[PDB]
């Protein structure tokens, strides 16, 4: 009974209020995006931001007041009972008035050992999958870091003072090797660090450092 009265309501209430809050802020963000479709956006950016912020403060204060009213009434009126009935309330026998045979008590025991088998197997899959995803994330982030580095090399300007042919042949040779290394990343299992890729880019950066030597 007291699990039901003192604990069951709590996670329900928390969820309802929390999802309401989130939806209020998704609502406000949809409003702001809509304003950007109007002629009014360009003309009145500060009025729109400040008004929408005022409306948000109000909307939040309305949700806070009524959803607190909601919290109170479910804890105090729905998840409550008349305390004069305390002393007539069963010594816990909804279940007890109904016979349960020994056959069925061992069968429920089977249906628990069976679903604990399913869950152990599935939890192995989740482990395997969590680690796969941890890798692919690292690898994505690493590769974006590398893409940014060569993009930067692509936006460097020739700052007009005489390039040595040994350096330009060294850049061409490293670019060649970087194609091969970037190709090996895509065709094979992801590692903690694509070292050859990283180093040839580092050589490329050093090459370009030498060309723009102040």
């Amino acid at each position: 009974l007291v699990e039901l009265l003192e604990f069951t309501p709590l996670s329900f209430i928390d969820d309802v209020i929390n999802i309401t809050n989130q939806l209020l802020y998704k609502g406000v963000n949809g409003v702001d995006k809509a304003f950007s479709q109007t002629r009014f956006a360009k003309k009145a950016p500060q009025e729109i931001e400040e008004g929408l912020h005022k409306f948000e403060v109000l909307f939040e204060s309305v949700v806070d007041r009524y959803y607190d009213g909601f919290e109170v009434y479910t804890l105090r009126n729905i998840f409550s009972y008349p305390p004069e009935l305390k002393g007539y309330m069963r010594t816990f026998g909804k279940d007890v008035d109904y016979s349960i045979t020994t056959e069925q008590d061992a069968a429920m025991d089977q249906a628990i050992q069976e679903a604990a088998e399913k869950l152990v197997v599935k939890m192995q899959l989740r482990r395997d999958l969590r680690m796969r995803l941890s890798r692919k994330r690292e690898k994505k982030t690493e590769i974006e870091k590398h893409l940014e580095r060569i993009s930067f090399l692509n936006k460097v300007p020739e700052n007009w003072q005489v390039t040595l042919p040994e350096t330009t042949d060294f850049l061409l040779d490293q670019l060649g090797n970087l194609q091969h290394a970037v190709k090996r990343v895509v065709e094979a299992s992801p590692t903690v660090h694509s070292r050859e890729v990283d180093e040839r880019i580092t050589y490329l950066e050093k090459g370009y450092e030498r060309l723009s030597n102040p």
Binding site: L4, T8, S11, F12, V16, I19, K26, G27, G30, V31, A34, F35, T38, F40, E47, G51, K54, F55, V62, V63, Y66, Y67, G69, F70, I78, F79, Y81, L85, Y88, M89, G93, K94, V96, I100, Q104, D105, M108, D109, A115, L119, K122, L125, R126, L129, R132, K136, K140, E144, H146, L147, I150, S151, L153, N154, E158, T168, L171, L175, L178, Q179
Partner: protein, 155 residues
């Protein structure tokens, strides 16, 4: 009237009163310079519809996820039973019933989580493959610029 009905009715009154307390007139007051009252109203109407419908959908789901109806029906019952008495192995099996309910919930939750996981992976694959094709043609573009520096040297 049942508890589960009392709750649902109150939760709807909460939402519906929330909405009544952010009505168009207060929205429009926040933007004094806007003359297309029509546009402001369409915007406000789309807010209220998103919020209301999304709220109702989420509240339906949490109510099922948390199994509240059975619970509140049991409470009504536990109070009916007490009235009846004021007028006029077992708890083993109930635990086992509760535990089996829980496992079966858990088995459904990890199929879902594991699906998310498999999907999130597939997106990580596709995003690194895209970053690599971008890498491969940036490399070709750097190749051209370096040949071009050599070609400039011949003049």
């Amino acid at each position: 009237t049942s508890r589960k009905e009392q709750l649902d009715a109150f939760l709807s009154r909460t939402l519906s009163e929330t909405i009544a307390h952010i009505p168009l007139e207060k929205f429009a007051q926040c933007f004094p310079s806007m003359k297309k009252g029509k546009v402001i109203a369409v915007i406000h109407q789309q807010l209220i519809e998103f919020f209301e419908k999304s709220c109702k959908q989420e509240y339906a789901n949490l109510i099922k996820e948390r199994d509240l109806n059975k619970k509140l029906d049991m409470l009504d019952e536990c109070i009916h039973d007490a009235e009846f008495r004021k007028l006029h192995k077992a708890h083993l099996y109930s635990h086992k019933r509760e535990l089996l309910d829980k496992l079966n919930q858990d088995l459904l939750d990890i199929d879902k989580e594991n699906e998310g996981l498999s999907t999130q992976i597939a997106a990580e694959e596709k995003a690194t493959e895209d970053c690599i094709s971008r890498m491969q043609s940036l490399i070709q573009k750097l190749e051209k610029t370096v040949y071009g520096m050599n070609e400039k040297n011949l003049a």
